[PDB]
Structure 1
Amino acid sequence: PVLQKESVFQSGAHAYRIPALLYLPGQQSLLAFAEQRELIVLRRGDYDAPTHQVQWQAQEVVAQARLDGHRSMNPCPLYDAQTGTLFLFFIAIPGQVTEQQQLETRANVTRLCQVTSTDHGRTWSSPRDLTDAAIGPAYREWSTFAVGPGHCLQLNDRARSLVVPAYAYRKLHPIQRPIPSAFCFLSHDHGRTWARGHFVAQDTLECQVAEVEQRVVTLNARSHLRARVQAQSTNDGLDFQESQLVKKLVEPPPQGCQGSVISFPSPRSPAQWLLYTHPTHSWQRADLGAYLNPRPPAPEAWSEPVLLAKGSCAYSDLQSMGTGPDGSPLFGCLYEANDYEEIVFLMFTLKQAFPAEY
């Protein structure tokens, strides 16, 4: 049972993909982002407590989130609890082959960008190209890269550091095709300066990060194997301990699929629990499921999944939304469905999803 299920983006031409969701705690509202085949679009929605429904407003293009002559992709939003400022990180790639690419097929021409808002996402700043400052000399060592997709992370450390999940196709071989590896971008000063963390295992792509109780950053990545890949860091994402396979979280080979993970206050030793969404079919992108980890980020502690939606489902993004009407944690989930013909918003509580916990 759920509180709300609504298609917030629809296109028979598969125009909308790559969902990103952001919850604003003071406003008690959601920002739902998506790529529109390319620019980034957004729908704002307030949680109407009296009816316990999110009232989605009209779709609008995030005009500022783009570079002239470039396609924008991978919306990666974050709310800075210290300043209240919102960050929308995104990727920008030339719409057409550049002269440089004409001579160097694998030349990196991808840009890391951001737009910020100081009015709860109503208006955005001019885009800021973070590429050189965040990646540095390693830039030429990759063919391309991306952040997210989906929400990023803000730690509960003294600095309230920003952690942006990412992955890059490394041109390690001149003949072999570039292989992707996940990593994190880290800032302790609200995005003024950035550090590029070390890569986790090879062949890891779209990943998301969460912080759990010392405090560690857990990175959960898409793989080309039959299970998810996870790794934890004790230094805010700069370095990760050996990557591990999470057999309890299935990945459909050979392509795998993007999934989402968030932490939330334990509803009961550990301070936080993790909630994760991803398709549950052994080899198809179908049957979106929600999984719980009560002793994060231990791979063997993941629960069996509960079905959130049957049928075709792909990428998703989660956000905790405070406390639900029944008294248990409230969650919002944005996911691709029906052969990429729509992006659906699902709102449910922990009690609804995992009744055994109550």
Structure 2
Amino acid sequence: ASLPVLQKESVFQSGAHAYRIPALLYLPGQQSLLAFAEQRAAELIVLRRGDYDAPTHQVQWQAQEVVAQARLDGHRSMNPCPLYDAQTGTLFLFFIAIPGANVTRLCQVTSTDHGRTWSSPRDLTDAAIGPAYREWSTFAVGPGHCLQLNDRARSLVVPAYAYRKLHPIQRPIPSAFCFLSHDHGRTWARGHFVAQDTLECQVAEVEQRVVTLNARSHLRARVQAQSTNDGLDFQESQLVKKLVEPPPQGCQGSVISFPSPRAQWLLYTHPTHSWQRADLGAYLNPRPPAPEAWSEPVLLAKGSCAYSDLQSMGTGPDGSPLFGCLYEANDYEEIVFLMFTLKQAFPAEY
């Protein structure tokens, strides 16, 4: 059986449309979650707001809505990557836009009323990427939640990857990297690539500040890399044999930091079958980012499970760290919300 959890609810399902590519964002101070996804016939991005009530151990989700401004004319919108700027009280949604040779665009919308309304999009593509743009076939952000650092500038870090046209007889090769802003998203720089054949990724900060990057790969195991200079360079990287990737070219997964009961630990979710996208597991790194220290997975959901996104939700009703998880289930017929505590998942680590 799978781990007892506080809540398991389908929050998007196939209907008139298909739902994929989840992203989850906790809003501290609001006891609220935003759950985003692509609404495909890709076309648009939709959002549901959930209010978390601890005494009933549950989130009540409001009605789904299109993020009408997260779009460019004649383009499909993909890869919702949200971020909450603690310093401003501003909500960011990053996304890519592709027309209905590199033609992919990086976009941002912004909200100051917690996601109820949104600015008109800004196209960041030229200023963020620059001459490199023509050396890529395409690129993406996230998908999923991004990162704010507690450096002086409270920098914004958007995980990403680009397919680089490195040798003309070879097909393009993907490498992960981060977009970086030090002025609250007014300007953007491209950090340096991690390593050949890394795809979708996410980043988390631990403590010496370290940004840990966890990425999908072509191999049978995850790639993880670490930056000591806040995402500009992931000076080191390697395979993480304890973290399996299934055929043919892996699956996206999510990583967050959260405060250590004993200053942070990591939590990571991803399908656990080496053979297929099934059996969503949670894994713990209590000595991060050491790759050796990743635990054995504990089972969060049986059956078909694919992309996920995690959020730290503060303290849970049993007093241990509370987590939210949004994941694609059941051969992509739904996106399910799961809520559970550290005590429930890793009782031996408490």
Change (3 A) 1:14 1:245: farther
Structure 1 contact 204–221 (Cα < 8 Å) conserved: yes
Stretch moving more, 112-121 or 241-250: 241-250
CA distance in 2 between partners of 1:236 and 1:30 (Å): 26
Structure 2 contact 54–316 (Cα < 8 Å) conserved: no
Cα deviation code 1:138-170 (max 9, x no counterpart): 011101100000000000111111000000011
CA distance in 2 between partners of 1:321 and 1:181 (Å): 31
Structure 1 contact 75–150 (Cα < 8 Å) conserved: yes
Shift of residue 12, structure 1, vs aligned partner: 6.0
Shift of residue 133, structure 1, vs aligned partner: 1.3
Aligned residues between the structures = 345
- Identical columns (%): 100
Structure 2 contact 155–181 (Cα < 8 Å) conserved: yes
SS of residue paired to 2:134 = helix
Stretch moving more, 216-225 or 44-53: 44-53
Instruction: Please name the residue that 2:71 is paired with.
Output: 66
CA distance in 1 between partners of 2:128 and 2:340 (Å): 37
Shift of residue 254, structure 1, vs aligned partner: 2.3
CA distance in 2 between partners of 1:50 and 1:64 (Å): 35
For normalisation by structure 2, the TM-score amounts to 0.97
SS of residue paired to 1:45 = strand
SS of residue paired to 2:338 = strand
Instruction: Please name the residue that 1:92 is paired with.
Output: 97
CA distance in 2 between partners of 1:177 and 1:357 (Å): 45
Residue 125 (1) aligns with residue 116 (2): no
Structure 1 contact 14–340 (Cα < 8 Å) conserved: no
CA distance in 2 between partners of 1:14 and 1:60 (Å): 13
| 1:23-102 matches, cutoff 5 A | 23-37=26-40, 38-95=43-100
CA distance in 2 between partners of 1:301 and 1:132 (Å): 40
CA distance in 2 between partners of 1:162 and 1:244 (Å): 24
Cα deviation code 1:33-74 (max 9, x no counterpart): 000111000000110233121000000000000000000000
CA distance in 1 between partners of 2:199 and 2:131 (Å): 21
Instruction: Please name the residue that 1:19 is paired with.
Output: 22
SS of residue paired to 1:135 = helix
Structure 2 contact 55–317 (Cα < 8 Å) conserved: no
Structure 1 contact 285–312 (Cα < 8 Å) conserved: yes
In the alignment, structure 2 segments of 5+ residues that lack a partner are none
Change (3 A) 1:14 1:278: farther
Cα deviation code 1:91-139 (max 9, x no counterpart): 00000xxxxxxxxxxx111000010000111100000001011101101
Structure 2 contact 278–304 (Cα < 8 Å) conserved: yes
SS of residue paired to 2:55 = helix
Structure 1 contact 170–181 (Cα < 8 Å) conserved: yes
CA distance in 2 between partners of 1:142 and 1:3 (Å): 44
In the alignment, structure 1 segments of 5+ residues that lack a partner are 96-106
SS of residue paired to 1:16 = strand
CA distance in 1 between partners of 2:80 and 2:211 (Å): 21
Structure 1 contact 93–110 (Cα < 8 Å) conserved: yes
CA distance in 2 between partners of 1:277 and 1:166 (Å): 18
Change (3 A) 1:13 1:202: farther
